[PDB]
């Protein structure tokens, strides 16, 4: 159905489609300020499955 | 370049606290003699003089004789610095992961026979034993036992096929009273805990680790093992809370250990004690218990063909410090289910560790809910289907639930070689032919020496160093490489292509000639219809072109073969290699291209519109020839040594010199 | 007596450097301790006392007449060093305690102990009643945590306690101890292989 | 719950399923499924939202 | 007789940082005459490919 109560999530060009998603894109995102592989390898070598 | 520091790292690779590091014994003295020295009670005395200094001399003897003891003891004292193996188990089974005695080899059979008595049901009861001659030797056939019980249908026309699994060995059970006071010992070598089952009075209790260990049999039912010191197993169970304590689902609580014994619970274990390592390969089998009325009319190798396999399997040395020491670290990191990448690869290290010399578990970023793995049979690259479902399974025990354990073995590179290897005749009274056989064991032991191990880039010449080394009569040697890769669609390339991480040389990219079935009609006399024509093609490279790119030219065709459209054409190059037919056929297509540089191929059949069907054959061996020297490997793709089941992969010529 | 029971080893010093020689020597590395664990449950053993401080092997000839076998009574005793593992004279624990004190610091007394024989530790008395104690680190002033008449133990006395403890030791009968001998012996062989 | 059992599904990842009878109902009521997955949530592996 | 593999032998040994190595050979004679052969003539004592 159309969806009547509303709250955000906000982006510099909000909504739209946005672009390529994958799969169901939904495969769980990382954020941080460090490069990755420099926690690339370690991640999936310990906690990431 | 290369690596600037700012006082980086830490201590070399490992921790030496380096105190305890044994010295020469003059230094030790060298050490000491100073030690004396500059003692307040005498600055006079010269050690240098002889007279002391063979009696401080001797003070070192001693205190280097006493040393090594406090030093060995901590490399003893600490895992990965123990030296001693039976040492190295322990840690190791104390930190939740033990090596394992040498694993009886397993194979399964399906067996059509036909009960004499006609009974619906037939159940093959556990330990009923069967012969298998080792591969090409028939001098003794290797016994072993039916693992578990086993019913099969009736089939209608009365005959049916029931199927079961077998390791080597035999049932050896021996029932003990248990007693408080007292070990529990197997003295039995050949012995192996994965197949060491158990009963207490009626009911099986199981090792917690590494069978089950989750049902809802509470944990009361439980047991441990434990490495002798000499080489046999004892036997333990928890005693007193056996469960993990006080009231838990019991509502009259109190306390429960069980094993009192008195007499109690006399302890009655099944086990099988094998020969194994040596079994692997035992193709020709018998069924070597009767029962009753029951009779093997065939009993047919390997259901579900891989269709590349040997009999049996399993066995094991057992014992390895190497891949032991570091590996139940990970183990001793990880919990016992298995989590991380690593751990699924440190847990199936294992079980199956000596199925396994090498396991590689990945992530297929396509597919989530899999847990892609590659291994290494270590008899041979293909773990029999069973197998895979097998660990797969018990795998499967530990993960996570949405996640699935999904094993393939990994493509792999070939390596294709004919050698070239001279000896002296008179310097070697021994029989020329068997040092054939001698070089064609030190060349896999240059492979299991490295190449398995990282999977890295590949010397060819240093891998002929070691059978250059193998009778020093040999006077040279030689050899030539072939990168061959194993294709699994003739009609299409994979989606990707393939690439070979090694640079080969244009018009060095061949394959494996191969028949097709042309439409056209061949009759003889005396052979009547005769179906229609089929003759042989291969893939071929083209040479190199501008930005290292070419076009694979197919194999020769006749004319009418191929309907000509105005889009293809015969490619009709100068270049493109040639196979020398009898036909003369010239018609050569474009069936696809490359480039050099990426190392790249693809093509496609459905390009030729050429039917699939009208090939023979699903597989096709490559062939190839890097440029390099030495051969790189980056991913799921490797180079390893088999020759007994690919041994037209591996050639050695012999250079009788006087 | 035990280690040149079993063969002598042979030894390489690898992990220290990737090429060290390697060494015979007689074998610790058996445990003995489980080795006398087995054939030890066969009898009991038996508590005992000593007369004075001496040594472990030393005092092991007197009950047994063979000096030979201090381990035997050492496993029993199972201590963790047997140079101080061992009853000592009241000279060496002084001393001893003097050392490891020393740094610290002499005479340091240890801790507070009541006449019920609770020992409290980390506690001095305002001294305006040395009968209440107020701890210490806390200026006083402020929760004492008890009040009475205390012993305080010297770091001396303290030294003898701690070694007084060990006096007692369960033994295995100088009857048996022949007896038992052979089967642990015979243990080993299973333990040869 | 009389007996939770608990269960996946590999087409649908990041999810788990367990199966109640509350044992005072046919069905296990609402207030006890969102009171439970609240209290379950503290543990929760990050990949996956069990359910 | 040289090897061109037991000489890989040792030049293998010099790092251990060395993956791998190989060479092409050629064996080289120089002549003292060029006008004329000496009339017995060179041999190399092993024979060559042709050209």
């Known amino acids: 159905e159309i969806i009547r109560g509303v709250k955000g999530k906000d982006l510099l060009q909000n909504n739209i489609d946005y672009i390529n998603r994958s799969r169901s894109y939904y495969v769980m995102k990382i954020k941080s300020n460090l490069p990755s592989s420099r926690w690339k390898s370690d991640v999936i070598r310990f906690v990431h499955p | 370049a290369n690596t600037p520091v700012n006082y980086q790292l830490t201590r070399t690779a490992n921790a030496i606290p380096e105190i305890f590091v044994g010295g020469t014994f003059a230094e030790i003295k060298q050490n000491l003699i100073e030690w004396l020295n500059g003692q307040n009670e005498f600055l006079d005395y010269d050690f240098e003089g002889s007279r002391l200094n063979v009696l401080c001399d001797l003070l070192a003897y001693n205190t280097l004789y006493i040393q090594q003891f406090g030093n060995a003891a901590v490399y003893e004292s600490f895992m990965r610095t123990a030296n001693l193996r039976s040492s190295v188990v322990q840690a190791a089974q104390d930190n939740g992961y033990l090596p394992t005695s040498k694993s009886a080899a397993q194979t399964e059979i399906m067996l059509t026979c036909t009960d004499a008595?006609?009974?619906?049901?037939?159940?093959?009861?556990?330990?009923?034993?069967?012969?298998?001659?080792?591969?090409?030797?028939?001098?003794?056939?290797?016994?072993?036992?039916?693992?578990?019980?086993?019913?099969?249908?009736?089939?209608?026309?009365?005959?049916?096929?029931?199927?079961?699994?077998?390791?080597?060995?035999?049932?050896?059970?021996?029932?003990?009273?248990?007693?408080?006071?007292?070990?529990?010992?197997?003295?039995?070598?050949?012995?192996?805990?994965?197949?060491?089952?158990?009963?207490?009075?009626?009911?099986?209790?199981?090792?917690?680790?590494?069978?089950?260990?989750?049902?809802?049999?509470?944990?009361?039912?439980?047991?441990?093992?434990?490495?002798?010191?000499?080489?046999?197993?004892?036997?333990?169970?928890?005693?007193?809370?056996?469960?993990?304590?006080?009231?838990?689902?019991?509502?009259?609580?109190?306390?429960?250990?069980?094993?009192?014994?008195?007499?109690?619970?006399?302890?009655?274990?099944?086990?099988?004690?094998?020969?194994?390592?040596?079994?692997?390969?035992?193709?020709?089998?018998?069924?070597?218990?009767?029962?009753?009325?029951?009779?093997?009319?065939?009993?047919?190798?390997?259901?579900?063909?891989?269709?590349?396999?040997?009999?049996?399997?399993?066995?094991?040395?057992?014992?390895?410090?190497?891949?032991?020491?570091?590996?139940?670290?990970?183990?001793?990191?990880?919990?016992?289910?298995?989590?991380?990448?690593?751990?699924?690869?440190?847990?199936?290290?294992?079980?199956?560790?000596?199925?396994?010399?090498?396991?590689?578990?990945?992530?297929?970023?396509?597919?989530?809910?899999?847990?892609?793995?590659?291994?290494?049979?270590?008899?041979?690259?293909?773990?029999?289907?069973?197998?895979?479902?097998?660990?797969?399974?018990?795998?499967?025990?530990?993960?996570?639930?949405?996640?699935?354990?999904?094993?393939?073995?990994?493509?792999?590179?070939?390596?294709?070689?004919?050698?070239?290897?001279?000896?002296?005749?008179?310097?070697?009274?021994?029989?020329?032919?068997?040092?054939?056989?001698?070089?064609?064991?030190?060349?896999?032991?240059?492979?299991?020496?490295?190449?398995?191990?990282?999977?890295?880039?590949?010397?060819?010449?240093?891998?002929?160093?070691?059978?250059?080394?193998?009778?020093?009569?040999?006077?040279?040697?030689?050899?030539?490489?072939?990168?061959?890769?194993?294709?699994?669609?003739?009609?299409?390339?994979p989606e990707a292509g393939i690439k070979y991480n090694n640079q080969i040389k244009d018009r060095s990219m061949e394959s494996n000639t191969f028949s097709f079935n042309s439409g056209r009609k061949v009759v003889n006399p005396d052979t009547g219809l005769e179906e229609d024509v089929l003759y042989d093609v291969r893939i071929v490279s083209t040479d190199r072109d501008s930005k290292g790119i070419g076009k694979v030219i197919i194999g020769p065709f006749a004319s009418g073969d191929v309907t000509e459209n105005e889009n293809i054409q015969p490619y009709t190059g100068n270049d493109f290699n040639k196979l020398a037919n009898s036909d003369g056929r010239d018609k050569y297509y474009v069936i696809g291209e490359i480039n050099y540089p990426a190392d790249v191929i693809y093509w496609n059949i459905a390009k030729i519109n050429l039917t699939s069907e009208k090939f023979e054959v699903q597989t096709i061996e490559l062939y190839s020839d890097p440029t390099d020297d030495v051969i790189f490997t980056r991913d799921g793709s490797l180079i390893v040594f088999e020759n007994d089941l690919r041994p037209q992969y591996l050639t050695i010529d012999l250079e009788p010199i006087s | 007596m035990l280690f040149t029971f079993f063969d002598p080893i042979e030894y390489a010093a690898k992990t220290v450097n990737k090429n060290a020689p390697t060494i015979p020597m007689t074998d610790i590395f058996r445990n003995y301790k489980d080795y006398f664990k087995r054939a030890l449950a066969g009898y009991r053993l038996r508590t005992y006392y000593i007369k004075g401080s001496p040594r472990p092997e030393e005092l092991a000839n007197a009950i047994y007449g063979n000096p030979q076998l201090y381990w035997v009574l050492l496993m029993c005793n199972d201590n963790y060093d047997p140079y101080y593992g061992w009853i000592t004279s009241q000279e060496a624990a002084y001393q001893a305690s003097i050392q490891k004190y020393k740094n610290v610091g002499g005479d340091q007394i240890v801790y507070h102990v009541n006449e019920n024989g609770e020992k409290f530790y980390n506690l001095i008395s305002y001294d305006d009643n040395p009968y209440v104690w107020y701890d210490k680190g806390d200026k006083a002033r402020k929760y004492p945590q008890y009040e009475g008449a205390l012993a305080a133990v010297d770091t001396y006395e303290a030294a003898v306690l701690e070694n007084e403890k060990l006096r007692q030791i369960k033994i295995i009968a100088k009857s048996d101890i022949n007896s038992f001998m052979n089967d642990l012996i015979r243990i080993m062989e299973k333990s040869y292989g």
């Open chain 2, 117 to 493: 008595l006609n009974r619906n049901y037939i159940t093959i009861p556990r330990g009923t034993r069967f012969l298998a001659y080792a591969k090409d030797t028939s001098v003794n056939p290797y016994n072993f036992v039916s693992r578990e019980d086993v019913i099969a249908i009736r089939d209608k026309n009365n005959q049916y096929f029931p199927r079961l699994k077998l390791a080597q060995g035999r049932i050896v059970r021996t029932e003990i009273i248990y007693d408080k006071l007292t070990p529990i010992i197997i003295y039995d070598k050949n012995i192996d805990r994965n197949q060491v089952k158990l009963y207490v009075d009626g009911a099986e209790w199981i090792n917690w680790t590494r069978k089950s260990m989750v049902h809802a049999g509470s944990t009361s039912t439980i047991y441990y093992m434990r490495e002798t010191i000499d080489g046999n197993t004892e036997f333990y169970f928890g005693e007193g809370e056996i469960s993990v304590n006080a009231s838990e689902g019991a509502l009259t609580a109190n306390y429960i250990g069980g094993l009192k014994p008195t007499q109690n619970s006399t302890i009655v274990i099944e086990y099988i004690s094998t020969n194994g390592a040596d079994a692997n390969g035992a193709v020709g089998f018998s069924y070597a218990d009767t029962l009753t009325n029951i009779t093997v009319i065939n009993i047919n190798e390997n259901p579900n063909d891989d269709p590349d396999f040997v009999g049996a399997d399993g066995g094991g040395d057992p014992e390895d410090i190497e891949r032991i020491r570091e590996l139940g670290t990970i183990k001793r990191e990880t919990q016992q289910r298995c989590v991380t990448a690593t751990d699924y690869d440190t847990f199936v290290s294992e079980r199956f560790g000596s199925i396994i010399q090498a396991v590689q578990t990945f992530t297929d970023s396509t597919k989530p809910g899999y847990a892609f793995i590659a291994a290494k049979p270590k008899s041979g690259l293909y773990l029999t289907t069973v197998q895979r479902e097998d660990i797969k399974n018990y795998l499967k025990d530990y993960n996570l639930a949405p996640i699935t354990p999904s094993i393939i073995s990994p493509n792999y590179l070939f390596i294709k070689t004919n050698l070239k290897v001279t000896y002296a005749l008179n310097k070697l009274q021994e029989s020329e032919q068997w040092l054939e056989g001698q070089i064609i064991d030190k060349i896999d032991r240059y492979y299991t020496e490295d190449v398995e191990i990282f999977n890295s880039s590949f010397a060819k010449s240093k891998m002929l160093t070691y059978v250059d080394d193998a009778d020093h009569s040999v006077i040279g040697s030689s050899a030539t490489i072939q990168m061959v890769r194993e294709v699994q669609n003739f009609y299409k390339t």
